[PDB]
């Protein structure tokens, strides 16, 4: 089954899913990194005023809603969304499985109020199930449907037209459609994180970071490439980037210029170039241009680790493989 996704300024990749019957629909981004299913609760008082903006699941309309009630909070690198979990039947591309789920009744304005989407589809492994709930694509494989028992992404670049599909997560298999030429493999350093290990980094034609080997984990719910703050900075300073509150800029009419960088996996280099990862929306030097790398210091047992989001997927489409453990990218078409 294929999902169609929408892209919102390639920084936002989410697709519909289904949530009780009659089913009430959901904008929900699809994340390798978490491992929990949420959408916003018609119990999230509208103080709240990111409820007062996005869809709320309402049990008392879901004829096939069964009560559960347990708190849990779920903590992202960049906020935290706190409820209690609910049952009922879920929709996702042409399947419909019993989940359990997370209603939310707390959403914080920042950053919920600049979410285009309105919850979450873990697509992790239950070793990181908060609340040990079994994950949805778990519950999916249980169903013994999926020719495959893996699952692939394809995040398009951005477009100012209503024609380009955004985005495209398949169940079960890769769609050839998104990519050419071989997958090439890397297996994981661990089922329960879909993180592998990654040989080196490097900006410009010299492997100055991550020598000595560091993680990477593929985070198809994070927007940027992220790095160790050190890392970051030191990766930064090359760039000749100016770092700001939250993020990295560079002049605009520099941005064209900028070096490659790349990513040693699994004995290949993944390369970016320079129109791969800056926003250049101006080529004026008097502007500043915003770089698709970010600073983010991922805690332990994860991390510390570097984290592949949505800059590296845009150019290499990406599949889960569950029954071997191991991440295979194909260069995307
Ligand atoms: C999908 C859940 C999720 N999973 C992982 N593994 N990491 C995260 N940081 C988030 C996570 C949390 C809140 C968010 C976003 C991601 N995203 C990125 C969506 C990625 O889609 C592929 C936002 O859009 C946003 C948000 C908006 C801002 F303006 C600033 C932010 F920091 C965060 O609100
Ligand atoms: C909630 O779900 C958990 C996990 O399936 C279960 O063990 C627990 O009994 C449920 N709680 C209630 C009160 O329904």
């Known amino acids: 089954?294929?999902?169609?996704?929408?892209?919102?300024?390639?920084?936002?990749?989410?697709?519909?899913?289904?949530?009780?019957?009659?089913?009430?629909?959901?904008?929900?981004?699809?994340?390798?990194?978490?491992?929990?299913?949420?959408?916003?609760?018609?119990?999230?008082?509208?103080?709240?005023?990111?409820?007062?903006?996005?869809?709320?699941?309402?049990?008392?309309?879901?004829?096939?809603?069964?009560?559960?009630?347990?708190?849990?909070?779920?903590?992202?690198?960049?906020?935290?969304?706190?409820?209690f979990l609910s049952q009922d039947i879920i929709t996702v591309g042409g399947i419909?499985?019993?989940?359990?789920?997370?209603?939310?009744?707390?959403?914080?304005?920042?950053?919920?109020?600049?979410?285009?989407?309105?919850?979450?589809?873990?697509?992790?492994?239950?070793?990181?199930?908060?609340?040990?709930?079994?994950?949805?694509?778990?519950?999916?494989?249980?169903?013994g449907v999926l020719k495959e028992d893996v699952f692939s992404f394809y995040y398009n670049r951005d477009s100012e037209n209503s024609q380009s599909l955004g985005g495209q997560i398949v169940l079960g298999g890769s769609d050839p459609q998104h990519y050419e030429g071989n997958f090439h493999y890397i297996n994981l350093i661990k089922t329960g994180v879909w993180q592998i290990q990654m040989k080196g980094v490097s900006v410009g034609?010299?492997?100055?970071?991550?020598?000595?080997?560091?993680?990477?984990?593929?985070?198809?719910?994070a927007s940027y490439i992220s790095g160790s703050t050190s890392s970051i900075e030191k990766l930064m300073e090359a760039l000749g980037a100016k770092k700001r509150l939250f993020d990295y800029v560079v002049k605009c009419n520099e941005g064209p210029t900028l070096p490659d960088i790349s990513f040693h996996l699994g004995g290949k280099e993944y390369t970016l170039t320079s129109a791969d990862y800056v926003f250049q929306e101006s080529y004026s030097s008097k502007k500043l241009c915003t770089l698709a790398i970010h600073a983010m210091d991922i805690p332990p047992p994860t991390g510390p680790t570097w984290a592949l989001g949505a800059t590296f997927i845009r150019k290499f489409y990406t599949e889960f493989d569950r029954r071997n453990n191991r991440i295979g990218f194909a260069l995307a078409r």
């Open 205 to 221: 034609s010299s492997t100055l970071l991550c020598e000595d080997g560091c993680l990477a984990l593929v985070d198809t719910g």
């Open 1 to 83: 089954s294929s999902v169609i996704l929408t892209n919102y300024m390639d920084t936002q990749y989410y697709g519909e899913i289904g949530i009780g019957t009659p089913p009430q629909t959901f904008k929900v981004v699809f994340d390798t990194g978490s491992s929990n299913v949420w959408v916003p609760s018609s119990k999230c008082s509208r103080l709240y005023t990111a409820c007062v903006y996005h869809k709320l699941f309402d049990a008392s309309d879901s004829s096939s809603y069964k009560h559960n009630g347990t708190e849990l909070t779920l903590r992202y690198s960049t906020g935290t969304v706190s409820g």
């Open 96 to 143: 419909t499985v019993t989940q359990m789920f997370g209603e939310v009744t707390e959403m914080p304005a920042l950053p919920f109020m600049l979410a285009e989407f309105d919850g979450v589809v873990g697509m992790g492994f239950i070793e990181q199930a908060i609340g040990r709930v079994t994950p949805i694509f778990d519950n999916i494989i249980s169903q």
